[PDB]
Design a protein around this ligand. Structure first.
Ligand SMILES: CC(=O)O[C@H]1C(=O)[C@@]2(C)[C@H]([C@H](OC(=O)c3ccccc3)[C@]3(O)C[C@H](OC(=O)[C@H](O)[C@@H](NC(=O)c4ccccc4)c4ccccc4)C(C)=C1C3(C)C)[C@]1(OC(C)=O)CO[C@@H]1C[C@@H]2O
Ligand SMILES: Nc1nc2c(ncn2[C@@H]2O[C@H](COP(=O)(O)OP(=O)(O)OP(=O)(O)O)[C@@H](O)[C@H]2O)c(=O)[nH]1
Ligand SMILES: Nc1nc2c(ncn2[C@@H]2O[C@H](COP(=O)(O)OP(=O)(O)O)[C@@H](O)[C@H]2O)c(=O)[nH]1
Ligand SMILES: Nc1ncnc2c1ncn2[C@@H]1O[C@H](COP(=O)(O)OP(=O)(O)O)[C@@H](O)[C@H]1O
Ligand SMILES: [Mg+2]
Ligand SMILES: [Mg+2]
Lengths: 429, 440, 361
């Protein structure tokens, strides 16, 4: 069957992974110790999309962590859902990259990528078939960006015909999660545009605004941001793990959302989000979801879609529902806001449906969107890059660890060319 | 013992097949367990007819259906549902590597690993035949399996068998509604490949059936169960004369004749008029003069193409129930005297007829009503060209920037093939234009 | 950003093949002079195409028989002349498997193409200018693309079951893209150039297919960097002026319909890899043709490595020739039409070739 191989490169990847496991398990019924404790049968049928069997109806996860520092691994081990992992998949080191891509792609990562790829081989060759990988990393660092990009490169050199989907976090515009962001982000985009099949863009400010505006949370921890991110990671694979009327694997979304290869950077979204008090006043029907999904607030990409045009959009629903409603609603959404879509893609929407909904919502959904509004996110990075490269503000720490000055100009040119590729269609022809 | 072989390819095919075999089972009394309490109850009988079903010494009647697919999310609902003790376990699921909604994967790369098994199964279901009559594919344009696997299968079956009917059902893509943004490519390609090998292709369109279910049965929130039940009633109406006693019986070789004039123009449209709930089951007489005049209404077709934008070219009307052959002739006559229904000057007849005595069944907890008589009309008309042109225009808007072509190329497809399919499908539009110019 | 220029295009028909004679194939191509015409066998429609140059090799007896010693003096000689004038030059092929695009450039041992004649005219024309005022220097390179991976052709592999060193590309800020680890060897006499080309032809990947028994399943590029140091008016030491030039000769591969030319395994994979490379270059030509019409258009070179290492040749600073090899077969009719279509779409490209000299004084 189809089998996803998870990887967690860095602190953000590890936290999102833990929350996602703590999301998929309560969906399939697995407990922290590894045993099955459920009510239905459709859970154990397609459990091999993420899990493996050990001995006694125990179910261990197919997660492969990596982190140059030792703290996050111990945090994930001593946590609630830590006794279920495979301890030999913990592949860490010491002396972290130090917010330096150079110290996470050439010098330190070169010593441990071999071990991580050994675990990847061991876990993949066990599988009957293979549908792709699923990484989680955060631009703005050296472990995540560097190590994950190197791993994507080596996998796509080894296993090319599969999907190296990754739910990358991008840096926020206003606040700076780290000082030297544009170098690492531009280099990661240089090493991702040409070595991927799909990719998702998450931003922290959009999630803060989602937490403050819809969910009405005044003190959101990182766990809430992550709990708002594992949702769509479930929604993507809901049509593999569960049955439905209209199925859609990752490859179907890839064929239908990436018209040209480089333009695979997307905007995710969840549908039914509301406060613990304003849930008894809202109607849990389909058009409320469809207008809560296309709004410029739910999108985690920190880029308003109204400033561009949706090249493609994809909607994975989960619930007992009527397909007439979904199809007619997408048609009228295309007809109303026609200027925010294209004309040379006649139908610019993909639908997909499951039948086994989430743990407590009778009707859930998930949204993906390729729009030209994401060129702003890279325009910003390139402007910062020029401002900090025109007189070499922080560059000497990258050269000393084995790099040169030409890779930077290469990454800048590629990012700008991609911005131009999106801007060619941002303008009505 | 004359036999027809059903083949179902994809999610839509399997769902229509489930809805079809539910209807067959509730008709003959043959049950999910394969056992029929009709031969061993009164003292004899042939109720489970061996044209679509089979027989085993233990009373188990295994049907004649492969239910092909390349994703186990669908067939496992059969294998772990109600109708698991009925079919043959050789359902030919792959379990691996869905086509991802391209034609090149389900014709070159993943299809070739699976087609030989399906052909062997068809041969094994056709060697115990003392002379079959034809095949029936249930494929869906707007996919990888329905577009590519059907092409490969009708290409291989035009080599081994050859002189046998290879009819098909097809979910025609709606012009506005669609659940895929890569469907026109596959549609034109399949119409390039499933043209010189097939005989007739009955088309349907989910939008028109949504509209009629809204307008007549008063459902505002329909799902594909109710759609597939209508299509199941249609495929029962077109497969009853072999399966039941009648007066003016139609065989499967008679669709190729009275409906496919030219060897390429074989894209007709189905219609089933008495779609009325139990509430409207009363207040209506439901005679032939009402039915046959409803089947020709533009707002009761199954494709979203207005018949008034073109001339009718052929029609096959197949009835069920208490039909006395004078209301049928009178209905055809008063339909001929109308100025809207416009025929061409080389087919004045255009009114094939078929009658049968067994009324239609009804599924419990369903949507339709118990009507003593039913009708199913299949029309070959010249309006379809417009719809084709729409898809063709889409092909010209998306191919002119080489969109999505790497995906089809990555599975070995050769862009020249796309241009060839385009030029082939344009000549068919020119043919639909030729068959409207009246004789000099 | 100097002088304007236009892309040269030339067409070449091959004679019948064995597979075509066995199948009783007709002649669906004819010349009305300098033009080209195609008649579909069913007699439903005609097409005509006009180019700057046309050739003919259907039979040795017709008039206007353009042979190997003719296509050179019609197409390649201007490239060498403009190279001596300073400009850069490219000549690249296009066509279908079996069309004759590794016969017009490389040739046979008794029917040389452009490559074994270009670098001979070079030396026949340099001997007339071997005086002490202009001193020449020539470096060569010969590289290959296979399964979207770069490889070097003139390198002695170590003894092992698999030794084909993968290499990488890199973008230079000023000049343009280029290859790393490139064996930019030196050449002084034809006796070395012929030997290097022999080693290359041996190392280039080959296999048998239905449409060609000796099919080349890789994209080959042959680069010559020429530099002439010259003396001019100066206040001190002489020999300070320098004129540089690059000469690229590019042999591409064919679409290779995987059904007719039946094959499975590695051959199918490199054929689809070859297909993707051919699929981006048509997009690039369609995007560069729309530059002259006045529309804003993106020119994607990065979707394939061949276009990535040939940005300077399509656009950039290089006078470029396109040799389109076609077939007269009636079965291979749509692919020939596609080749001619891309040719007439490639004529409209306008590039800016500038004399490139660094005084260094
Ligand atoms: C009656 C009812 O509606 O209870 C809801 C509820 O009130 C709300 C607040 C739930 C609640 O969601 C949150 O509290 C929340 C907090 C921060 C960030 C994001 C969410 C809920 O926690 C979420 C939870 O839903 C789930 O459990 C889903 O399965 C969700 N599960 C988890 O993520 C999860 C994580 C850790 C442990 C257990 C479950 C999920 C979503 C997608 C895919 C898989 C699982 C349920 C029923 C509710 C509560 C509990 C209040 C909502 O959940 C989601 C993911 O949308 C928020 O909006 C929906 C519906 C309601 O607004
Ligand atoms: N009538 C009807 N049509 C359906 C049904 N389910 C899906 N479809 C149609 O199927 C099309 C896309 O799915 P398919 O073409 O069937 O895809 P497939 O044949 O399952 O092949 P895959 O790509 O592997 O999914 C859509 O355009 C739908 O209109 C159904 O239950 N009934
Ligand atoms: N969105 C999100 N971001 C996080 C989370 N946890 C940490 N981060 C951010 O991730 C950024 C990068 O950290 P990281 O690259 O892992 O540090 P490293 O270990 O030195 O490589 C930090 O600046 C944090 O602010 C999380 O749960 N969600
Ligand atoms: N002008 C020509 N005259 C005679 N034979 C030719 C001519 N052009 C090509 N051929 C024949 O065609 C073949 C060359 O095709 P080729 O270019 O090698 O295919 P590909 O480029 O697809 O590898 C050779 O076998 C050669 O004999
Ligand atoms: Mg499917
Ligand atoms: Mg060749």
């Amino acid at each position: 069957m189809r089998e996803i191989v998870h990887i967690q490169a860095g602190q953000c990847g590890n936290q999102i992974g833990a929350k996602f496991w703590e999301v998929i398990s309560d969906e399939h019924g697995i407990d922290p110790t590894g045993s099955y404790h459920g009510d239905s049968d459709l859970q154990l049928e397609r459990i091999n999309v993420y899990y493996n069997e050990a001995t006694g109806n125990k179910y261990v996860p197919r997660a492969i962590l990596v982190d140059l520092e030792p703290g996050t691994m111990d945090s994930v081990r001593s946590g609630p859902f830590g006794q279920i992992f495979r301890p030999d998949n913990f592949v860490f080191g010491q002396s972290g990259a130090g917010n330096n891509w150079a110290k996470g792609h050439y010098t330190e990562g070169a010593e441990l990528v071999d071990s991580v790829l050994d675990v990847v081989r061991k876990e993949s060759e066990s599988c009957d078939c293979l549908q792709g990988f699923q990484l989680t990393h955060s631009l703005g660092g050296g472990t995540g960006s560097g190590m994950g990009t190197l791993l994507i490169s080596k996998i796509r050199e080894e296993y090319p015909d599969r999907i190296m989907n990754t739910f990358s976090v991008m840096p926020s515009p206003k606040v700076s999660d780290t000082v030297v962001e544009p170098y690492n982000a531009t280099l990661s985009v240089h090493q991702l545009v040409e070595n991927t099949d799909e990719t998702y863009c998450i931003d922290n400010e959009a999630l803060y605004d989602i937490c403050f505006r819809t969910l009405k949370l005044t003190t959101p921890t990182y766990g809430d941001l992550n709990h708002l991110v594992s949702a769509t990671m479930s929604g993507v694979t809901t049509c593999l793990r569960f049955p439905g009327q209209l199925n859609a694997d990752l490859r179907k979304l890839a064929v239908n959302m990436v018209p040209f290869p480089r333009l695979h950077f997307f905007m995710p979204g969840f549908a039914p989000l509301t406060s613990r008090g304003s849930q008894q006043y809202r109607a849990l029907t389909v058009p409320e979801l469809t207008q809560q999904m296309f709004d410029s607030k739910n999108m985690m990409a920190a880029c308003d879609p109204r400033h561009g045009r949706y090249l493609t959009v994809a909607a994975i629903f989960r619930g007992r529902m009527s397909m007439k409603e979904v199809d007619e609603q997408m048609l009228n959404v295309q007809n109303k806001n026609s200027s925010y879509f294209v004309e040379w893609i006649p139908n610019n929407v993909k639908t997909a449906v499951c039948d086994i909904p989430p743990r407590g919502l009778k009707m859930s959904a998930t949204f993906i969107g390729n729009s030209t509004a994401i060129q702003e996110l890279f325009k910003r990075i390139s402007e910062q890059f020029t401002a900090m490269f025109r007189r070499k503000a922080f560059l000497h720490w990258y050269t000393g660890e084995g790099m040169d000055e030409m890779e930077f100009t290469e990454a800048e040119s590629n990012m700008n060319d991609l911005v131009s590729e999106y801007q060619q269609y941002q303008d009505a022809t | 013992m004359r036999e027809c072989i059903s083949i179902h390819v994809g999610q839509a095919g399997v769902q229509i097949g489930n809805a079809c075999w539910e209807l067959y089972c509730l008709e003959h009394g043959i049950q999910p367990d394969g056992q029929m309490p009709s031969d061993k109850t009164i003292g004899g009988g042939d109720d489970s007819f061996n044209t679509f079903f089979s027989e085993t010494g233990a009373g188990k009647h295994v049907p004649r259906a492969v239910f092909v697919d390349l994703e186990p999310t669908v067939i496992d609902e059969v294998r772990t549902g109600t109708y698991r003790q009925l079919f043959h376990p050789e359902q030919l699921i792959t379990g691996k590597e869905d086509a991802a909604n391209n034609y090149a994967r389900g014709h070159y790369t993943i299809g070739k690993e699976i087609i030989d098994l399906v052909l062997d199964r068809i041969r094994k279901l056709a060697d115990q035949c003392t002379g079959l009559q034809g095949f029936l594919v249930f494929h869906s344009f707007g996919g990888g399996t329905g577009s590519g696997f059907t092409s490969l299968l009708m290409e291989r079956l035009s080599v081994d068998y050859g002189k046998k009917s290879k009819l098909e059902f097809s979910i025609y893509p709606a012009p506005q509604v669609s659940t895929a943004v890569v469907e026109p490519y596959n549609s034109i390609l399949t119409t390039h490949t499933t043209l010189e090998h097939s005989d007739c292709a009955f088309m349907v369109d989910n939008e028109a059936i949504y509209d009629i279910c809204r307008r007549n049965l008063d459902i505002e929130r329909p799902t594909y169960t109710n759609l597939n039940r209508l299509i199941s009633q249609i495929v029962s109406s077109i497969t009853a004369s072999l399966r039941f006693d009648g007066a003016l019986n139609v065989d499967l070789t008679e669709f190729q004749t009275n409906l496919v004039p030219y060897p390429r123009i074989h894209f007709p449209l189905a219609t089933y008029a008495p779609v009325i709930s139990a509430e409207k089951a009363y207040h209506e007489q439901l005679s032939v003069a009402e039915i046959t005049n409803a089947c020709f209404e533009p707002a009761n077709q199954m494709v979203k193409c207005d018949p008034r934008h073109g001339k009718y070219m052929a029609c096959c009307l197949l009835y069920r129930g208490d039909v006395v052959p004078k209301d049928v002739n009178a209905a055809i006559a008063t339909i001929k005297t109308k100025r809207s229904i416009q025929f061409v000057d080389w087919c004045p007849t255009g009114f094939k007829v078929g009658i049968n005595y067994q009324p239609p069944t009804v599924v419990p907890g369903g949507d339709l009503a118990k009507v003593q008589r039913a009708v199913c009309m299949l029309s070959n008309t010249t309006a379809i060209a417009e719809a084709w042109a729409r898809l063709d225009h889409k092909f010209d808007l998306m191919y002119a920037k080489r969109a999505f072509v790497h995906w089809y190329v990555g599975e070995g497809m050769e862009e020249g093939e796309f241009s060839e399919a385009r030029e082939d499908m344009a000549a068919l539009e020119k043919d639909y234009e030729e068959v409207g110019v009246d004789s000099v | 950003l100097g002088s304007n220029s236009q892309v040269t295009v030339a067409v070449r028909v091959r004679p019948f093949s064995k597979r075509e004679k066995t199948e009783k194939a007709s002649q669906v191509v004819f010349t009305n002079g300098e033009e080209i015409t195609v008649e579909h066998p069913d007699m439903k429609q005609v097409y005509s195409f006009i180019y700057d140059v046309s050739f003919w090799s259907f039979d040795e007896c017709h008039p206007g028989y353009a042979s190997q010693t003719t296509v050179y003096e019609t197409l390649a000689a201007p490239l060498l002349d403009r190279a001596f004038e300073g400009y850069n030059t490219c000549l690249f092929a296009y066509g279908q498997t079996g069309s004759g695009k590794s016969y017009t450039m490389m040739g046979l041992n008794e029917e040389p193409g452009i490559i074994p004649r270009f670098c001979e005219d070079l030396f026949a024309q340099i001997a007339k200018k071997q005086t002490s005022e202009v001193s020449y220097h020539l470096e060569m390179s010969f590289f290959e693309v296979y399964n979207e991976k770069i490889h070097d052709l003139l390198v002695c592999k170590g003894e092992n079951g698999q030794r084909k060193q993968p290499l990488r590309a890199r973008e230079h800020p000023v000049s343009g893209p280029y290859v790393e680890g490139l064996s930019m060897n030196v050449v002084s006499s034809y006796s070395d150039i012929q030997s290097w080309l022999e080693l290359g032809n041996k190392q280039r990947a080959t296999a048998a297919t239905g449409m060609n028994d000796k099919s080349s399943r890789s994209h080959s590029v042959f680069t010559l960097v020429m530099t002439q140091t010259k003396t001019e008016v100066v206040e001190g030491e002489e020999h300070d002026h320098r004129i540089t030039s690059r000469i690229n000769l590019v042999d591409l591969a064919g679409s290779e319909r995987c059904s007719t030319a039946h094959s499975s395994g590695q051959r199918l994979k490199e054929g689809v890899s070859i297909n993707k490379s051919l699929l981006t270059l048509g997009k690039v030509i369609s995007a560069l043709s729309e530059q002259a019409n006045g529309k804003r258009v993106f020119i994607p070179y990065r979707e394939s490595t061949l276009t990535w290492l040939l940005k300077e040749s399509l656009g950039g600073n290089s006078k470029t020739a396109m040799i389109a090899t076609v077939s007269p077969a009636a079965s291979n009719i749509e692919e020939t039409l596609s080749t001619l279509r891309y040719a007439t779409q490639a004529r409209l490209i306008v590039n800016i070739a500038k004399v490139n000299e660094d005084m260094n004084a």
